[PDB]
Amino acid sequence: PNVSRTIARELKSFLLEYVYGARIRTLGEMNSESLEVNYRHLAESKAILALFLAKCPEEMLKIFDLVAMEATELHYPDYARIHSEIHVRISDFPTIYSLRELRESNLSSLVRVTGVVTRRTGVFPQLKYVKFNCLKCGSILGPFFQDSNEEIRISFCTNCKSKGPFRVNGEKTVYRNYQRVTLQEAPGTVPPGRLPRHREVILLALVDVSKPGEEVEVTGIYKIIEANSIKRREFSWTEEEEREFRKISRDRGIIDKIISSMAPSIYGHRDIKTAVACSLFGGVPKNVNGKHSIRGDINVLLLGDPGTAKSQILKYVEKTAHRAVFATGQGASAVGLTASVRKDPITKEWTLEGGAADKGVCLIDEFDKMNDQDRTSIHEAMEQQSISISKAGIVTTLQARCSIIAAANPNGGRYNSTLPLAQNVSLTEPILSRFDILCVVRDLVDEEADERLATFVVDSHVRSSPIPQELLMKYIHYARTKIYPKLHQMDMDKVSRVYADLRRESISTGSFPITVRHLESILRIAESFAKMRLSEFVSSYDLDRAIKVVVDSFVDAQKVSVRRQLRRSFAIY
Amino acid sequence: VDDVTGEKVREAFEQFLEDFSVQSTDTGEVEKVYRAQIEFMKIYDLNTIYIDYQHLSMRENGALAMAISEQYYRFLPFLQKGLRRVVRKYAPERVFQISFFNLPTVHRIRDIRSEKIGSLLSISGTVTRTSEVRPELYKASFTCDMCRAIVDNVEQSFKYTEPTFCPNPSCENRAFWTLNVTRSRFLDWQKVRIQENANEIPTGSMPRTLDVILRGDSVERAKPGDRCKFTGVEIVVPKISFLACHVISIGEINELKEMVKDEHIYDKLVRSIAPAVFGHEAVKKGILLQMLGGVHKSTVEGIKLRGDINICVVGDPSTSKSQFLKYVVGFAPRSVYTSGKASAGLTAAVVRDEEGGDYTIEAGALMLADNGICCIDEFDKMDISDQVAIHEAMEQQTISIAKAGIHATLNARTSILAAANPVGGRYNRKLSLRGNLNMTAPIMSRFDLFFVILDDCNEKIDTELASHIVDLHMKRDEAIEPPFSAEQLRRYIKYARTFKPILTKEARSYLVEKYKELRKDDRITVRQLESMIRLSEAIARANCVDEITPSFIAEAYDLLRQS
């Protein structure tokens, strides 16, 4: 149509009257081909262009590249010798859709969707055109083939009129660059009972800038989604809820209220939920001059009798938290640590995908019942916050810095308290050393516990002071994405004095030692409590709760013969 | 011959849709609700209507339904054109889906012949596997070789078609038009696997499965591993496939009101749940209370709890404890039986599909039943992997499958009926249950009730048992006969299932003392307390009393004391 000719000259006058000169000089000097245009800018200028981009973006994209190349040609001479075409990046889409709202009415239009990328393919062959060799007469014939069907069977020759066997000739054929990533819905925003959907995305002209296993925002057209723009930056906090969170965090020591708000179904005890809350709230990751990456996550390990609740609590924690997936699994396990390089049968190739939480928390149930692959993958992810892929022609180190909450059972049911935890569990010491907190429950008897536990669990079943659940789960996302509390060298050296007592007393009476990882763990627990307290820095008494958390985990993980250590730690209790 | 019959049946269908409005105030006279249904969907524009076949069977003395019922594929565009004309005249991007439901006859997968090709059919069964939704071409926009003219081509659900003549006489060629996707409406197309139910399989036969196609907005509703009932059209695929339009999650009052007003119902119910077994009232009590559960709903936080009853039978060799196993599966429709020794499969195994080399989760023993009893014979000869898969499926009422990078968990509700035997067979009273059962604590936990059966020489009941065995060995004896049949017992089980009762304060005050009395015998923790709490609403539903009194929970306390 000639109506595009009055569209072209409109936006040609728009780019010289708005930041577009700085945008075109940055794409021209970086020899770049990506031009950035915000939707609000031209939408404030002309809403009819925004309506045309929302209705027919495929014919709207035939004007954009031409006027961008014309602006680059009169701004820079001979730019067509190196770069023939320059694309545009339509960002700032207001109506962000979900993957379950993708319907028949959203066809041939612009859509911004959130997701997680997996099984990414780079520069993998795509077909646009074909040819075919007819074997009977030995002739050539060719049509078209895009990116959705398998292939358009050709069975009728020109003059053979035969049903002979035909062969695929792609030795005169088109050149297609294909990078399709199977995007999935995030588990932190899926409704309960339903399953997350998945789609296939085409990436062209934007390959290997995306990270698998992370949240992503893609703006493209819907037909199979053909992505135009990618964004690796991304139930949220608002302005009306952020002032009341600081007002709630300033009054009445909210750490214990968050602990009491963690388990509404049962009474429990604070040793499981204190480790659970400090593991979900996490610490901060720090590096010195680009190296020495410390793990900011806290991996907790639960142990005890089978009757006691370990799965219900984990499930509740997962529901409460963002990007937390309860993978669990024993026999099912399959590919360990969600990271895998594998062949794919749809088009016969090699691909890499990190399964399903790079910032999230992964929940493992029945830790003692696994094979060699899923133990080694979680040992690599616990040793380092990354999983490397070094096969099928690809080498990629993906983020596996996810917190680990594992639950296990001992060999025989009973805890057998007259033996240490190393003889009790089947696991050894270096896989136990990655877990900083080892919480363990035991058995109990008198009327007191019978009067409280059964009444609280029957109160939880007869019904269909603490902090409410919605404000708590909004506070988790508000504190984990805005603050980073450091430490100041004013009086922190005193903990190096008390560690100097606490290390030495573990040799003379105990058998298992205390190392520098426990010091890193109590600094992470103290900064996690400072994160939950929403302070600027860690206080002096946060380390008191941190040393209490490490004493009732390490001393409780041993025999009854470390009983003198129950009173030896009473001076700092 | 149907070219002049199609316009007449289109006029009859639009007269059926035009002559029926809504006059349903004060439960008076009846008339169909279709015009208000179209007026309600006017805002949402989905056009995925539901028309009842029972409501269509009254016109022309059923003769309009019988003529449409055999020539459904030959009358379907006339029906959609009549629906299009009535929504074009009653109301001002256009796709349509007409769904029929509630057929009076339920047909199996083994009674499908070639005489019903093209007719409508009701197929019930269980879904084995599912295929991810893909766009259906439906209709495409072809462009000519020289005219560059648009042609709206309608596919016929067989294979990629192609026109023959250009409509504009600017050309008359037959060379390759080119396909176009802008002006071609696309509908999601899913292909799932339906299979024969476990209660209607012939003796020695194989449970033959079949693939059924589905379009419109009937997709993404059918959950895997759940008994389903489809209504559609038998369409051949170059194989005899099926097309469904309606999905549902499936799986007299004078007799029911007479049976809930008496007082001795429960005593005939404990001796009528297994009429072939002499003795063992406690095992019959647990089997009767293990069919119906309760109070699982939602915890005050947001997590679902284990509201089911787990039943496990143990004892010496050569008893009648497998007979219950043979009864449940012959009477309960939601019942899957496995041999146990010859068994991932239990916890829903993973199998690959070559289209995308993608995984699908087969239910197997663990997820086949919904609100039913999965019965595993020989529980102690199983491996460690399936028993930790059972434990992973039991801590939380869900099952997780981790394969090929994807992790998927789903809600499966089952009541495990575990038949076990000792390490030596003979049960010795010398030691505890743990050393004789020979299985670890966690897999020993989350079990509500254990039934230990010991035998010896006690002539007075033994002669009666042997006489009952030899009196049973005849052609359909009356000795076995129950006080009432299963005919009202099935609807009684369903009526007690949809009841949903609750506990009081006196029951909780007696329950805390009962938990102290159960813990005074000491393993016993919160799980056995949850098992007796779940058995309380099951015995409340079985006795059909809403607010529970502690006297009916006293029998459950005595049942726990008897074990």
Residue numbers in the entry:
A (entry chain 2): 201 to 218, 226 to 412, 414 to 431, 450 to 460, 474 to 595, 599 to 706, 756 to 864
B (entry chain 6): 103 to 194, 260 to 405, 451 to 463, 512 to 603, 606 to 784, 794 to 834
From the paper:
Helicase loading at DNA replication origins depends on the Origin Recognition Complex (ORC), Cdc6, and Cdt1 (3–7). Here we employed a previously reported Mcm6 mutant, which is missing the C-terminal WHD (amino acids 839 to 1017) and is referred to as McmΔC6 or “mutant Mcm2-7”.
The previously reported 3.9-Å resolution structure of the WT OCCM aligns very well with the mutant 3D map.
